[PDB]
Amino acid sequence: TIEVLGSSHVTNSINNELFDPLISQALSDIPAITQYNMHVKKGIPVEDFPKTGLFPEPLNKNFSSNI
Amino acid sequence: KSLSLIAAHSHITGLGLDENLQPRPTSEGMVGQLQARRAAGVILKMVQNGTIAGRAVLVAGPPSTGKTALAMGVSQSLGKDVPFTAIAGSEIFSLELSKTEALTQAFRKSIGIKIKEETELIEGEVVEIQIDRSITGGHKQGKLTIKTTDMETIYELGNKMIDGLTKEKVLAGDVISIDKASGKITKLGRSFARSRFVQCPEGELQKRKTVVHTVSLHEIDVINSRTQGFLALFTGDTGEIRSEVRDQINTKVAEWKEEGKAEIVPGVLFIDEVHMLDIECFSFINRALEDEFAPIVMMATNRGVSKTRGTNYKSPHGLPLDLLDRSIIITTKSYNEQEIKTILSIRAQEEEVELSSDALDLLTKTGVETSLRYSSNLISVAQQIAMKRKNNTVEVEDVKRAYLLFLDSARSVKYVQENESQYIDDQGNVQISIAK
Amino acid sequence: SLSLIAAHSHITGLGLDENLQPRPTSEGMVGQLQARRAAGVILKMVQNGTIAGRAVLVAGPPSTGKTALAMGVSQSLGKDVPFTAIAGSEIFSLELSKTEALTQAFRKSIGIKIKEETELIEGEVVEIQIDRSITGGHKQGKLTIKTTDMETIYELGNKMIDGLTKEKVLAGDVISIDKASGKITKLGRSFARSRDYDAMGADTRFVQCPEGELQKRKTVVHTVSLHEIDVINSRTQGFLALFTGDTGEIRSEVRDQINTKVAEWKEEGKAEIVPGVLFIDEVHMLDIECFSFINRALEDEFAPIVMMATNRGVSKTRGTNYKSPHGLPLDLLDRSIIITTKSYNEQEIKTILSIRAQEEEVELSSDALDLLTKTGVETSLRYSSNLISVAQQIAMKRKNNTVEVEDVKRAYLLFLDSARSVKYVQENESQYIDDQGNVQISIAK
Amino acid sequence: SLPRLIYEDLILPNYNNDVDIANKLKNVKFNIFNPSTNYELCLFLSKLTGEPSLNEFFRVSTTPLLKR
Amino acid sequence: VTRTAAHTHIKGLGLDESGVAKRVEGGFVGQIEAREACGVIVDLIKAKKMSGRAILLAGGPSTGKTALALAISQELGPKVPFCPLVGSELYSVEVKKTETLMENFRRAIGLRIKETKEVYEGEVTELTPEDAENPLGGYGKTISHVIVGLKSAKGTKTLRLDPTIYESIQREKVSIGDVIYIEANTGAVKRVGRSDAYATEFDLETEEYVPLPKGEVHKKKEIVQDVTLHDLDVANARPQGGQDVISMMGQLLKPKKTEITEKLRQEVNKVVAKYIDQGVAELIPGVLFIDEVNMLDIEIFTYLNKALESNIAPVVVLASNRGMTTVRGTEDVISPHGVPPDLIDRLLIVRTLPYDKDEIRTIIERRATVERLQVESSALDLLATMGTETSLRYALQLLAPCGILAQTSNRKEIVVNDVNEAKLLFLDAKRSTKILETSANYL
Amino acid sequence: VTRTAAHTHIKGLGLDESGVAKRVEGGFVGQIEAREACGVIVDLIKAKKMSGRAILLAGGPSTGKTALALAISQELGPKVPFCPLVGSELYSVEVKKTETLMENFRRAIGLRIKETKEVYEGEVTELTPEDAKTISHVIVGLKSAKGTKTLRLDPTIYESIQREKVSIGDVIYIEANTGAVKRVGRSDAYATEFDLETEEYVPLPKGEVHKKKEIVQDVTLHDLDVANARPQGGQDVISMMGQLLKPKKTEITEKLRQEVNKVVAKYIDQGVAELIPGVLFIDEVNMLDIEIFTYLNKALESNIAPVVVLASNRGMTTVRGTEDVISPHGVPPDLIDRLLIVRTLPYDKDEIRTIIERRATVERLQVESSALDLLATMGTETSLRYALQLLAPCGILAQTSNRKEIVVNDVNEAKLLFLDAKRSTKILETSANYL
Numbered sequence A: 001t002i003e004v005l006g007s008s009h010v011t012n013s014i015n016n017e018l019f020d021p022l023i024s025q026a027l028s029d030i031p032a033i034t035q036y037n038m039h040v041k042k043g044i045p046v047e048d049f050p051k052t053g054l055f056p057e058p059l060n061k062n063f064s065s066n067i
Numbered sequence B: 001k002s003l004s005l006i007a008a009h010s011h012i013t014g015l016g017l018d019e020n021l022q023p024r025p026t027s028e029g030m031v032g033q034l035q036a037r038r039a040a041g042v043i044l045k046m047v048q049n050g051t052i053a054g055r056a057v058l059v060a061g062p063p064s065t066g067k068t069a070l071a072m073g074v075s076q077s078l079g080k081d082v083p084f085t086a087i088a089g090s091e092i093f094s095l096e097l098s099k100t101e102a103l104t105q106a107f108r109k110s111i112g113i114k115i116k117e118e119t120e121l122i123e124g125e126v127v128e129i130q131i132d133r134s135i136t137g138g139h140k141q142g143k144l145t146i147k148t149t150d151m152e153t154i155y156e157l158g159n160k161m162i163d164g165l166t167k168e169k170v171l172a173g174d175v176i177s178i179d180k181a182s183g184k185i186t187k188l189g190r191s192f193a194r195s196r197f198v199q200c201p202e203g204e205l206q207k208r209k210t211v212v213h214t215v216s217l218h219e220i221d222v223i224n225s226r227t228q229g230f231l232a233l234f235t236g237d238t239g240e241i242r243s244e245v246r247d248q249i250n251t252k253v254a255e256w257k258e259e260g261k262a263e264i265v266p267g268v269l270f271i272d273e274v275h276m277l278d279i280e281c282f283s284f285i286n287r288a289l290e291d292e293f294a295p296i297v298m299m300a301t302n303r304g305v306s307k308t309r310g311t312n313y314k315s316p317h318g319l320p321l322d323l324l325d326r327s328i329i330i331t332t333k334s335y336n337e338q339e340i341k342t343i344l345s346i347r348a349q350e351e352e353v354e355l356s357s358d359a360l361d362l363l364t365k366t367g368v369e370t371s372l373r374y375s376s377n378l379i380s381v382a383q384q385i386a387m388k389r390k391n392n393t394v395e396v397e398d399v400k401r402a403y404l405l406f407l408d409s410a411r412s413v414k415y416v417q418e419n420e421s422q423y424i425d426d427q428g429n430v431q432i433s434i435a436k
Numbered sequence C: 001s002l003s004l005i006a007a008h009s010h011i012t013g014l015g016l017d018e019n020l021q022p023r024p025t026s027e028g029m030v031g032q033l034q035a036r037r038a039a040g041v042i043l044k045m046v047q048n049g050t051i052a053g054r055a056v057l058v059a060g061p062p063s064t065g066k067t068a069l070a071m072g073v074s075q076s077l078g079k080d081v082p083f084t085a086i087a088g089s090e091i092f093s094l095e096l097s098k099t100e101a102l103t104q105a106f107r108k109s110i111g112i113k114i115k116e117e118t119e120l121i122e123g124e125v126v127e128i129q130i131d132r133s134i135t136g137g138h139k140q141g142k143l144t145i146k147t148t149d150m151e152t153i154y155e156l157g158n159k160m161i162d163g164l165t166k167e168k169v170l171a172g173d174v175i176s177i178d179k180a181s182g183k184i185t186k187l188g189r190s191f192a193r194s195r196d197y198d199a200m201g202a203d204t205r206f207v208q209c210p211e212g213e214l215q216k217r218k219t220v221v222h223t224v225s226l227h228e229i230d231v232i233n234s235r236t237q238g239f240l241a242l243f244t245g246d247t248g249e250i251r252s253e254v255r256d257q258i259n260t261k262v263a264e265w266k267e268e269g270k271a272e273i274v275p276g277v278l279f280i281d282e283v284h285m286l287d288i289e290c291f292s293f294i295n296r297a298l299e300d301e302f303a304p305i306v307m308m309a310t311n312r313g314v315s316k317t318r319g320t321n322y323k324s325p326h327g328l329p330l331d332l333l334d335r336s337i338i339i340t341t342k343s344y345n346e347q348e349i350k351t352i353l354s355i356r357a358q359e360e361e362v363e364l365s366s367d368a369l370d371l372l373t374k375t376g377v378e379t380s381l382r383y384s385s386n387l388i389s390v391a392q393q394i395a396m397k398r399k400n401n402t403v404e405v406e407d408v409k410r411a412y413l414l415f416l417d418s419a420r421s422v423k424y425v426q427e428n429e430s431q432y433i434d435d436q437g438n439v440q441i442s443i444a445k
Numbered sequence D: 001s002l003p004r005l006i007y008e009d010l011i012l013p014n015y016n017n018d019v020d021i022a023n024k025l026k027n028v029k030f031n032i033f034n035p036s037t038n039y040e041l042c043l044f045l046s047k048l049t050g051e052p053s054l055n056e057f058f059r060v061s062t063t064p065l066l067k068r
Numbered sequence E: 001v002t003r004t005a006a007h008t009h010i011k012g013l014g015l016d017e018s019g020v021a022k023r024v025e026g027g028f029v030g031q032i033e034a035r036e037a038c039g040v041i042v043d044l045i046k047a048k049k050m051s052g053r054a055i056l057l058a059g060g061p062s063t064g065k066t067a068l069a070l071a072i073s074q075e076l077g078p079k080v081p082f083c084p085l086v087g088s089e090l091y092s093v094e095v096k097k098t099e100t101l102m103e104n105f106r107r108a109i110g111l112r113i114k115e116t117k118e119v120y121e122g123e124v125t126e127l128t129p130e131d132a133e134n135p136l137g138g139y140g141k142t143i144s145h146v147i148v149g150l151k152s153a154k155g156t157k158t159l160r161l162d163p164t165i166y167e168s169i170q171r172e173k174v175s176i177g178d179v180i181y182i183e184a185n186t187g188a189v190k191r192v193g194r195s196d197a198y199a200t201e202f203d204l205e206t207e208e209y210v211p212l213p214k215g216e217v218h219k220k221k222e223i224v225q226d227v228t229l230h231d232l233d234v235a236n237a238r239p240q241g242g243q244d245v246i247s248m249m250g251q252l253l254k255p256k257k258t259e260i261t262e263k264l265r266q267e268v269n270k271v272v273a274k275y276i277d278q279g280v281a282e283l284i285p286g287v288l289f290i291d292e293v294n295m296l297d298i299e300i301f302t303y304l305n306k307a308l309e310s311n312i313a314p315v316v317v318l319a320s321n322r323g324m325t326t327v328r329g330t331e332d333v334i335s336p337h338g339v340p341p342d343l344i345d346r347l348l349i350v351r352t353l354p355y356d357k358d359e360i361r362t363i364i365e366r367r368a369t370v371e372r373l374q375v376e377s378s379a380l381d382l383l384a385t386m387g388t389e390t391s392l393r394y395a396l397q398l399l400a401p402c403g404i405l406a407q408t409s410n411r412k413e414i415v416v417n418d419v420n421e422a423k424l425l426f427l428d429a430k431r432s433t434k435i436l437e438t439s440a441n442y443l
Numbered sequence F: 001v002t003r004t005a006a007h008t009h010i011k012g013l014g015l016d017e018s019g020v021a022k023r024v025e026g027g028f029v030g031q032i033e034a035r036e037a038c039g040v041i042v043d044l045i046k047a048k049k050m051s052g053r054a055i056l057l058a059g060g061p062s063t064g065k066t067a068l069a070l071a072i073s074q075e076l077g078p079k080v081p082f083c084p085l086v087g088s089e090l091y092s093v094e095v096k097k098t099e100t101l102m103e104n105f106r107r108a109i110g111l112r113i114k115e116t117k118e119v120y121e122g123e124v125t126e127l128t129p130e131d132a133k134t135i136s137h138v139i140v141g142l143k144s145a146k147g148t149k150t151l152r153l154d155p156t157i158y159e160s161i162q163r164e165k166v167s168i169g170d171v172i173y174i175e176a177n178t179g180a181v182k183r184v185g186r187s188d189a190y191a192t193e194f195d196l197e198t199e200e201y202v203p204l205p206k207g208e209v210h211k212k213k214e215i216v217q218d219v220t221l222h223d224l225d226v227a228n229a230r231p232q233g234g235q236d237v238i239s240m241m242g243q244l245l246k247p248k249k250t251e252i253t254e255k256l257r258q259e260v261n262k263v264v265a266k267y268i269d270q271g272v273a274e275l276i277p278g279v280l281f282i283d284e285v286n287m288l289d290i291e292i293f294t295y296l297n298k299a300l301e302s303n304i305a306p307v308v309v310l311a312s313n314r315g316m317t318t319v320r321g322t323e324d325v326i327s328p329h330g331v332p333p334d335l336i337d338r339l340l341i342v343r344t345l346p347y348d349k350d351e352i353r354t355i356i357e358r359r360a361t362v363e364r365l366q367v368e369s370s371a372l373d374l375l376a377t378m379g380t381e382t383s384l385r386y387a388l389q390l391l392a393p394c395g396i397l398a399q400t401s402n403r404k405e406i407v408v409n410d411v412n413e414a415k416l417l418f419l420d421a422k423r424s425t426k427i428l429e430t431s432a433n434y435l
């Protein structure tokens, strides 16, 4: 963690770099009922969705965690 | 802080000098070498004045004669906040950095920038937190009661403070510190309420604290170069920082110095075993000393008229004459029996070892016979033999047992030379069978 | 412009006739008639283009004109023909093998020629109207574009509509669309709207509105080397490797496929093959492995004509432990023809110095020119060539527009040549660091 | 811990530093893929690669790798 | 039944409480003075006060130098760290040898930490998210909160999850009816398995069925961990374990060794010193063993001179079998055991001696006892005479072909004919050299 | 106060208007002919017409070569690029040495760009976007202590505004030409909406909202080559954490350099730019390989090459990378045929005394005249650099005994404490065990 005492711009920049919505949306997926809500009850087409599901799958179910 | 077991130079707390730069016979763990200590005090005043830059000082002498200990005394007498980079000679032969780049990074880690800034903090003990939330969480109303030993207050809380308080969960009786601008809340622990443990703060709640930062030039060079972030200061893969960013940093530091926003502090770069460097490193050092942003370089070597690395000729101290022309040489001497006895006494008091007087005389005799470091090493293994037979003070026969068990160099060379058929020679010829 | 007066910028082609007979002084070249005739023969060999894989060797003493001859061949070759000029030290890379670097240098010197047609509609967008069907399966577009003279109405496909959603237009940006190809680009904003939005932004740029005919027709001709095709087909986005050099040992099967498709395009009639010259200056620092690779690579059909220049005597071949003529092995010298060069005399030195003083905008007197000619007879030629330009500055500091003998004498006294420095070193060698690292610093013994 | 002076005088633009001016000068005005100044190179690369838009090279050359 | 390989007949130094070595106990025969010196070194290591001490084991080939180091490692116990090295392992193509030596120096300092974990666990019963107002607003995620209903034994809790936690929740592919395990220290989620309260035999994904977790959903537990300083160094150098973008991308890239700067080591030392001062940590220094020390060159020796003078470095044990050999990386210096004299001045040499006929005979007897073979007395005498005549190792390695040849003849004991046949079938170094001298075409 | 490091008593060549060197001028003592030759070279560089001219200045150690090079750099001024270099810096492990040589060649050619900086700053009082899902424009009304100002903005800047999370009452910073948006903080008028808050509060700007300034940008061709040849891609303006993939140096092709030259030549013809060639200075030129010496011959014949200045202190020495090539100053003869050699002569006693007095004056030390002749005798007996480096221990030892003047006892004490090379060598020969 890098801190600058008495500045709010550095906190916003660090929170944008660590938790970038585009990359974090690329490394995950939207829930199914949320996808149904935006595609049908909001009129958003499928091609205007953010990119999801680019995390590579592990070998097993056991290989997905360190606990 | 600064965890450490016991070092080989842990008994040295600094140079033993008075106000007139004269060495005491025994002070701050240093015994003997009065001329070397006086010269190192002059170099210390050279560093502390800070009005000149780029001077080379060579410390040369026989092995195991106070060479690294002088540098440790200088570094201990320098104090905090002044940089001190201590590298070895063979450390600059990298695989992803050139030798001149590694030398430049070692040079620019010894110049610091002093910046003073003031912040506002709120530190106190939490009395009561009252949070009112809606069903959907669209709005939240908050009241926080916080106190010190001298005042009590209640704050009306905003949305972002409420979200920053439910994160990093705080309860009653905690002692916390809040920065208003950045929103960072640090839990310092719990107060003295049994119902880790930290005494309640006193005085005003909102204090104005000024902190003084010391940032090396290499950190600004890494940060200003946009190819890698600040994490390269820890991972170490900076990877050949260019020169235009260094020029920009130099011009900006010179611009900050005129307006009083920053101060230049110089440090000491210590290069132990300087004879291991290559000729190209010497040629880079010949021009790196002629810059305004250059520290004071201390080099140590024990070679006498050795072959310069990367060449085919022999040079004094293993260094070419161009580097020796730019340097002033401090020479160390060998020790008498009284200096060896005093050093062994200090090393005995450092390791919490009780020595008898006859054992000290035997250790001094076998120190002036073979080496100082052998007799220094014998004490800690003689103490285990003393403790094995359930005795506290180290006696004569314990030192004799340690002399019998662990060999020195001169006995091992003779034992090798009498039985040369049992060891592998330079031709790879050995004999393993006993008979024939 | 971005060109200063270089070492040999006065040479514009070989000074030859129509019967390949060199004139004594023409096109900036003086003397060296046999080498100029040989270079004209090689130039006609290149311009014929039916002979592939020939190696010539320009050999001579230093400061004779081998690189000047190569520059003259390059200038007389003309444009749109690839002429690669590399040194011998450039192929020792860290990310590429010497074989791969030599293969890339070989394939950079042969190209193909492609001609295409363009129907450019360049203008400023006035207003765009999009018609959507009730089903939504197709989108219709009415585009109102204009130049400074006239304006028409165009009907648009759905691919135009999706191509104009990307790099979006805001009714006043200057675009240009092709008809047959349909290439879409956005040049920038017009100058008429420069006082509208009060702050420019990041990517925007202001261009003038195009004037005249809206629909233009233009034929352009491209010349692409085979190495560019290799780099393009090696990756997914290959032009970044074309401009940053990060290709990294392209495989052989893509080269075979590219050779087969080049032969197919030549047979069909889409493109024609333009050969070229590869010049390897200072060839004597190449390894023996590079020489063996050159020996094998000279026998392929897609090989350029290789020009090599060296000035070594009977010297050691690098990577071996023996000596050889020109620093080259004998099997490489077997498959080659040698053009030799001869040293100059007083008159050719005087003519070269006069031409170089004419090029550098320096006026000399006759006596100063004769003094510089005598110096170039005794010392080398480049010493006098530098003496001219420093004597010009001395004369300008003396507030005189011409260079006289006193300025040449002052420049001779101030700046030394090799022989005087050798004599001064050998007279006072105790003050210099010798090969053993011994030096005497102090002046008093 | 980083001092505030370095951050406000070396990273963010203000009235006394030229971060934004030099950024626009190096990355936009002097870019060799600009169609306003280097249209011939863009046309040559579009014939070479087969891209249907001449602004694709300027877009590709100025984005990070992960976003690309 | 069990696997034996050139060792594992040795269980320790075999000393009494006074440090006096027995003649034959603990799997050791002879070498009394070296074993007593190693016992003194073992007591010095167990004192846990010194730093940067070093000894050197010097002797001929096949005399028991590696055996003494393994006996030291067995006498110390498994809690004290022990890093065995060969001298050829320090030359790597990814990072310089100096950094590899410092890595092996930091790999031999242990630490024991009592660690407290905040744990939410239970069975997922309700998994309900709710949406944002403008999902295509560019900034902010698609959802805003996720409601998770957890049920444990004698308890039930509901949680409103942050989206960042929900990324790790949905990366584990949890569902309704799964028992999960959320670690609040790092945000890591472990999916244990399907609950056994529902049916079992209707699955096709070979899942594991687990009962409900005992106790409440929210827990705090204390965990004792064993961690070396090098582990902390490589954890901070390549950060994997967060829920951010950088920590997520750190697990997918190919790992590579990097030159860890001294600033990170100073920060790690400061944090470890704070942990020790808080009373939750205990420092366990260890032993670094570098066998075949003559393979090192002058640069690693010169860096080792500096590295032994730090205040953290552990006890270093070296070994060599050279008499008077030039140091590698030099041309004309000559030093005992291939170790330069400035490094020799900081050592404590422990001499090792060759064996006799009776010691060879009882070593052969014990190694035949370990390998579960029965040897006749005359065959044992012949094997001892062979070991004196040729090599101890040659007589050691001829036991198992003798056992195979005895077993092929349907016998249990080993007799003289099997020893003679193993002599005739298998050769030693001297006879092979004598054959090579009287050879035709470089045999 | 002021830091002096082995130089900075040199302010120039000390020439007159006619190029004749005075004896003591510009901090230079003696050395008339080398200073006059360097003045001629300075005039040739200021002519700005020729390309690829190379000179070499050779002499003994500690004789004034680097001082002459820095005097040339001081004579040219700060607008002319000057790239110092040592010969050992060309050996990098990321790219070949020829690429590094070409990079240092193109680092010494500069450009001058006339630019205009326009800045709006102040408190936001109105933020009303207008559409025609796509915003047509946005109207922003700023406010400072001298009044208000209302601006229209395109949606591209509006996207950067909502990137910065800007609401009503924040103090912002908008650059007109580049479109940069920076949020400074909330205004002090809204500091009492809550007792405890996360936002930081700043006062109103006391100046006007609209500010204009003329600036001059200095760049080199190497900066444009680096900016056009990023291998991974572009970068954002703010990146506190680096890229996940490490970008190393790459061998930049000739095509990129040709395109950069074409773009710069187009920009020069419109009067936007101005081309200033500079000096590439390479010290310790004898530490170069034969391959770099060969590639230097090709690089010196280009059309854009700057003026190259080399230094060497070797005599008849074997070239590095060869076996049996003996050439003067460690420089091969095919390269030696391309330069002009300037000889640099040693010093006698009185100039050594005068230089010692000059360095004592610069370092703010007072030396008695009795100690000055002893220091000059010491300098002639051992080295000039040994006498120059002994001034500060003498000053410290004088200041220790509460004296502000150098007394010859301090010089004797500093001679006793610190040795030179010759006495240390005599200790080395008359010793038993490794000194």
Ligand SMILES: Nc1ncnc2c1ncn2[C@@H]1O[C@H](COP(=O)(O)OP(=O)(O)O)[C@@H](O)[C@H]1O
Binding pocket: B008, B009, B029, B030, B031, B032, B033, B062, B063, B064, B065, B066, B067, B068, B069, B070, B343, B372, B373
């Ligand atoms: N004057 C002194 N005072 C205290 N200890 C000393 C002194 N001189 C030498 N020593 C001790 O002798 C040992 C060798 O010193 P050192 O200078 O490190 O060896 P070397 O000369 O090989 O560098 C050190 O452990 C140091 O503690």
Ligand SMILES: Nc1ncnc2c1ncn2[C@@H]1O[C@H](COP(=O)(O)OP(=O)(O)O)[C@@H](O)[C@H]1O
Binding pocket: C007, C008, C009, C028, C029, C030, C031, C032, C061, C062, C063, C064, C065, C066, C067, C068, C069, C311, C352, C381, C382
């Ligand atoms: N025939 C010629 N006509 C005009 N100039 C020449 C001629 N030959 C040589 N020169 C000049 O001599 C200079 C050095 O010759 P160069 O070609 O470098 O010799 P080399 O081929 O041995 O390297 C060049 O600047 C060139 O202009």
Ligand SMILES: Nc1ncnc2c1ncn2[C@@H]1O[C@H](COP(=O)(O)OP(=O)(O)O)[C@@H](O)[C@H]1O
Binding pocket: E006, E007, E027, E028, E029, E030, E031, E060, E061, E062, E063, E064, E065, E066, E067, E068, E363
């Ligand atoms: N005192 C001993 N008692 C039993 N076996 C021994 C003894 N000394 C050596 N050995 C055996 O001799 C072999 C060689 O010893 P080791 O130390 O591994 O190699 P070296 O002595 O060549 O370094 C080992 O397999 C070990 O089992």
Ligand SMILES: Nc1ncnc2c1ncn2[C@@H]1O[C@H](COP(=O)(O)OP(=O)(O)O)[C@@H](O)[C@H]1O
Binding pocket: F006, F007, F027, F028, F029, F030, F031, F060, F061, F062, F063, F064, F065, F066, F067, F068, F313, F355
């Ligand atoms: N004419 C002079 N006047 C004043 N100082 C000089 C003069 N000549 C040399 N010096 C000084 O003597 C020193 C010589 O250093 P330098 O020129 O770097 O040595 P070298 O010529 O071996 O590179 C410099 O510190 C410089 O300040």
